[PDB]
């Protein structure tokens, strides 16, 4: 048969170019060339074109040439996977290392070397951490699984998995070097977050759901569980971090492998035809695409035989970036396996051209073409138009691998439900819709027949035996014990908050029906839920959250208790906002979901269950005046002084029958002011025991997701290190605790405002749009005097009714304050202290820098060479401008020289031509304040509205001026600027147009 | 981190019959699956450490000496050469042989060892080296040598007898269980089976020159060996 000589030549073809090389006793093949190293993405990679021949083969059965030949493919694939396995095992003590305290140091060796499977590079002269290996590893070891293939063999082999996952869940977190292990464009020995990382090892963790590794055999214990919050806020990440390649790198070849067949871990599909059309537009080529802009690899100058690039390419790299056409074979598996015909036959069209002949006339991929070192100039005035020749390794394994899987599936040998047996190819289908059920308990007969005389129909904490609630934290405690392991030293997943996705669905233990409440209802855990307005809210924005993905099978089940603190002050009703929302849940619709009110019982017909198989069988003075002390705020002072003098952990023997600790006093009045619900001490015995809000460092990633640099406290010159990078919750602790200092309150109201501005994002991201940095200190500072000037009082009575106010009541003013409404000096104020600046802000400073020689703004300076280091789009912009533009320390003016920037950039677009000199704004400034005053005494005004600004020398009449208008700040701005020009021009004007 | 090579064969062989024991039922609830792992599990190890060293097997095939033969004990933890050739000898021969017929008797039962045709070819070379074993001397079972135990090597009859059982076991026998094909079945030369015959039917009755009789006779007229079809003798 001609398909039977067809696959004939295919399996000659793999057998001389791949298969030659398959490194007996441990399986690994070299990475090409004289390297004689093992790298674990580019033999998974390699071995995609041997399971696809394997899988053909296994179609035309009932020959005994065809079996053996398919069973030869399929055993020398899984030698390949056990191989790679036990590279893996190698370094447990390295994963659990890693697994608490995330750090380059602690991470697994991306290169590994070649038989005895030993390593062949320390620990810090390469870049040993690269989660997209690993994910891709992982992906590829279920999908195989998925297929039949038996590869994960042994219990703990599947505990090592289970680890391994664990450890990989923290990839959105986290820096990477990426996958061409350079960290950002320049090295520097710097890492930076990825999209491919976070994409594809969110879709590991789909794959791998529910996954049984011993195949149709297999059993209970031998499965793998895997939380859908970390797939979610995977997700999240890649939605809200993918206009581009990463904070870095405006556009990445590699972001290919995210939105095309390897994966399949994206969604909006318009996101993809985007992007698809970006990459298309920025790096394709005549010889294939660039990996990314500015990119110093295999290049004829940077002296190849260096490393640690100094950040001095503004040309050398550009235009003369080299092609690959791995990525034109990414693109042909792309078009063969959704839906496309046409662009697959285009692509190999123009891939054939560039493929180059070996040995007996077989296709052979190079790795890259390079530009000349001749033709360096034509190709720099006249982009793709000079020749490039042949470089790196000829038989590059990954690339013809890749090439050989997309002839083969578009011959038509092979369908795309073959490779994916998991069906991923319908990731972009749109859902229609999800329902969420909800189920309210009284905790005592008293509320439920409370409940019962307002039209409430529920059920009690009892009379459910068969079903138990408990909170999140028992939860959290039975996933910790997930994966241990005693022989291999093996911890089990690290313990770590649970989100809503998590609790809502069912869970079987000892076949026993457990439901639990959603995490954040614990008072002890902080005080946010005391609020009723602010639980009204976050129930909102959490059903919100439930009802938006829901991307686990089955329907979800929300259990909400309703306990004694929310009752009124009589204690005889529920309040107003309770009663108002359960209303509206008995109504079908409430936020944005559509809810049933049920039974639990009805409920626990249809419903998202899972199966935990794996928990299957003077002193005395000081204590009598603190007893016999009134006024409780003084009471909580003593109770801090005595925990910080002499009172860390010791007994204060306040009584005599039994000995409480001051743990346990401090519980107490922590409970007996909650009922008085009186917010004058509930900040100070926060701070005392040292509680932090649940998913900080969720809130910090949420934060940072989006190009924004955060700070802690009130900024002097040393201290106050700005955040660029995630860091882990002790790291992020220590932090705010350092910031903070002695005053313990700064940590506890940092913590509230930081998850106040991280919850707003989500929900409206347009109040932070043109932001660039948010510091905690001054914006507490600003609202501050906002209270001292709203109250007319003191700097301390504003900070006291500041700490008095609820929850809900911070959250309203700093709405408030973030949309800027409620005067033009304290408009000023407010908008130099948030540091708001227009967005074509940057674009007109850049201009300025490039038509100038530089701007002085009364100290130091900043040179016009920077534009050349430097583009519009980078974030090292971002943080030099701002340096360079916080040096006053006035708000007022800050204001003052953006708005002169800005006629200065208004003036220099008029006028076509060169200032060559040194621009100062102070100077302009100072001019446009004395017009003003010569202008106000010249109309006839007196002294006592020609104020002088006691630490500026401006007039208080000028920041009270309107920005537009006849007598308005800008005309003088203006004037001052054109007094500046002519003063630096050879006595004469060239303002043309 | 010493580790014997026959301690891990009749450890595996333990998982094995537990685990056709549990064959019986059908519904497992996933242990079958696991001791056959095991088995498995545990014949690729000793099938990877004997794969590392090639260049002495091709020593092997060409001057059988003690001083170039396969080691017998390795790490137990990254499968390494542990102890030289001046304190342990790591002459003997028993050990492969009951390594090849306890292969066969897996593979015939049903299972899936060997991966790639290098592995049939270094089994067919191992199973060259095994073709003289009636010539060389060796260390025995005991890897004391002989009674007096002064570092001498002789000949044993357990020995003989084992390679004997593991030339006729792996006689056209198929590597590849039932998908195979006519590739990958190992040869035997008759002439080196019968001159294993002569020299274990004439020294059978005792155990070596220096012993005459020995516990480890045994299992080579038992049940891992059965290697003698003669009933009187027996």
Known sequence: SNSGVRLDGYARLVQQTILCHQNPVTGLLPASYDQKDAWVRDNVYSILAVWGLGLAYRKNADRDEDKAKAYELEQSVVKLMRGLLHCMIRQVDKVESFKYSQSTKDSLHAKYNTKTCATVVGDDQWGHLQLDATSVYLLFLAQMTASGLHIIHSLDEVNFIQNLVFYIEAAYKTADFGIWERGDKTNQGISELNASSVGMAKAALEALDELDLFGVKGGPQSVIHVLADEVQHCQSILNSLLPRASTSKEVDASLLSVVSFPAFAVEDSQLVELTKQEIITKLQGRYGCCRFLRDGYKTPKEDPNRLYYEPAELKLFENIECEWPLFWTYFILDGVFSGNAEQVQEYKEALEAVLIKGKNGVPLLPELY?????????????????????????????????????????????????????????????????????????????????????????????????????????????????????????????????????????????????????????????????????????????????????????????????????????????????????????????????????????????????????????????????????????????????????????????????????????????????????????????????????ALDEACTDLLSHQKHLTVGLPPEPREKTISAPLPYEALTQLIDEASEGDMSISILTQEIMVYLAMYMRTQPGLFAEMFRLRIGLIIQVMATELAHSLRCSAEEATEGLMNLSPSAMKNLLHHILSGKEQWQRRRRLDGALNRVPVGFYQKVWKVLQKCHGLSVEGFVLPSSTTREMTPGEIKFSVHVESVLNRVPQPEYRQLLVEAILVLTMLADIEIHSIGSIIAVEKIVHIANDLFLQEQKTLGADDTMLAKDPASGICTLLYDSAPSGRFGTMTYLSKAAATYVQEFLPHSICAMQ | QKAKIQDSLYCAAGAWALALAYRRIDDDKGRTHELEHSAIKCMRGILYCYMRQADKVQQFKQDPRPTTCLHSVFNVHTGDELLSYEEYGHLQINAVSLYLLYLVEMISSGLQIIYNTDEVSFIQNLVFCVERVYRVPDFGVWERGSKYNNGSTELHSSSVGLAKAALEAINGFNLFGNQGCSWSVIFVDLDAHNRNRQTLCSLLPRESRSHNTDAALLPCISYPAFALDDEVLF
């Open chain 1, 370 to 694: 390079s530009v000349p070192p001749d033709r360096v100039d034509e190709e720099y005035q006249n982009p793709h138009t000079v020749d490039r020749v042949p470089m790196g390794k000829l038989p590059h394994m990954w690339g013809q691998s890749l090439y050989i899987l997309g002839s083969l599936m578009a011959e038509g040998f092979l369908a795309p439900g073959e490779i994916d047996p998991l069906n991923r190819r319908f990731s972009t289908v749109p859902k229609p819709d999800v329902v969420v059920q909800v189920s309210i308990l009284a905790e005592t007969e008293e509320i439920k027949t409370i409940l019962k005389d307002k039209g409430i129909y529920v059920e009690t904490i009892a009379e459910v035996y068969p079903i138990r609630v408990q909170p999140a934290r028992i939860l959290s405690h039975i996933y910790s014990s997930l994966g241990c392991n005693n022989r291999m030293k093996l911890s089990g997943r690290p313990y770590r908050h649970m989100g809503v996705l998590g609790t809502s669905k069912l869970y079987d233990i000892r076949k026993t029906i457990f439901t639990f409440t959603p995490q954040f209802i614990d008072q002890q855990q902080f005080y946010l839920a005391l609020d009723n307005k602010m639980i009204v809210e976050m129930l909102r924005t959490d059903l919100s959250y439930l009802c938006s993905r829901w991307r686990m099978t089955g329907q979800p089940t929300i259990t909400f208790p309703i306990s004694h603190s929310m009752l009124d002050e009589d204690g005889t009703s529920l309040n107003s906002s309770i009663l108002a929302a359960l209303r509206k849940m008995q109504d079908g619709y409430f936020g944005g979901a559509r809810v049933q009110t049920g039974k639990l019982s009805e409920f626990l017909t249809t419903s998202c269950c899972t199966h935990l198989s794996f928990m299957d069988p003077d002193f005395k003075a000081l204590v009598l005046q603190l007893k016999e002390t009134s006024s409780l705020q003084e009471q909580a002072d003593i109770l801090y002084m005595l925990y910080t003098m002499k009172g860390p952990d010791w007994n204060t023997e306040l009584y005599n029958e039994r000995s409480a600790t001051v743990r346990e006093l401090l519980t107490e009045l922590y409970g007996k002011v909650g009922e008085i619900r009186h917010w004058g001490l509930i900040r100070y015995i926060s701070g005392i025991l040292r509680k932090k809000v649940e």
